[PDB]
């Protein structure tokens, strides 16, 4: 009749509880093993692999495929945020104008020459000086 929590080992006496990974949980005990974030709310998905209960970020950290940056030629980790231009992928900090070194924001206009991101403002002098 009574149910046991798989995160605190105490009996559930609360009004609302959860059911995940063939277990019962107090609303707060269902957390990521690496960061400790609660998985029940915020439209946060639950991931399970090799005994670990993980959030999307920490799952990709442990099991996701890594990519290569078009600017720094260094590996991008699966959990890291990126800017994607066609089939090229960049670290967030490497997504800047190859001319002025300005970091970009949503709504900004640019061109892609090779793997060089050039802002709208700098196209003219880049073309004269490089083609």
């Amino acid at each position: 009749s009574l149910l046991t929590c798989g995160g605190c080992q105490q009996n559930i006496g609360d009004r609302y509880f959860l059911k995940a990974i063939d277990q019962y949980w107090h609303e707060d005990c269902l957390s990521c093993d690496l960061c400790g974030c609660r998985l029940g709310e915020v439209g946060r998905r639950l991931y399970y692999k090799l005994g670990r209960k993980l959030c999307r970020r920490d799952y990709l950290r442990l099991f996701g495929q890594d990519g290569l940056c078009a600017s720094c030629d260094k590996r991008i980790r699966a959990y890291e945020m990126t800017m994607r231009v066609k089939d090229k992928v960049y670290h967030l900090e490497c997504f800047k104008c190859a001319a002025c070194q300005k970091h970009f924001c949503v709504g900004d206009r640019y061109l892609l020459i090779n793997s060089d991101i050039v802002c709208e403002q700098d196209i003219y002098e880049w073309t004269k000086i490089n083609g």
């Binding site: 991931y47 990709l60 495929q65 990126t82 900004d108």
Partner: protein
């Protein structure tokens, strides 16, 4: 000027990955409850 592109929202490196290891969270209510 047709070659010009617009900066959008950043994406997750492994956005495609992880569907098969996703597990359901079932919302339940306790039958025996009183204060």
């Amino acid at each position: 000027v047709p070659d010009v592109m617009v900066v959008g929202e950043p994406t997750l490196m492994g956005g495609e990955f992880g569907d098969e290891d996703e597990r359901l969270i079932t919302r339940l209510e306790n039958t025996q409850f009183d204060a």
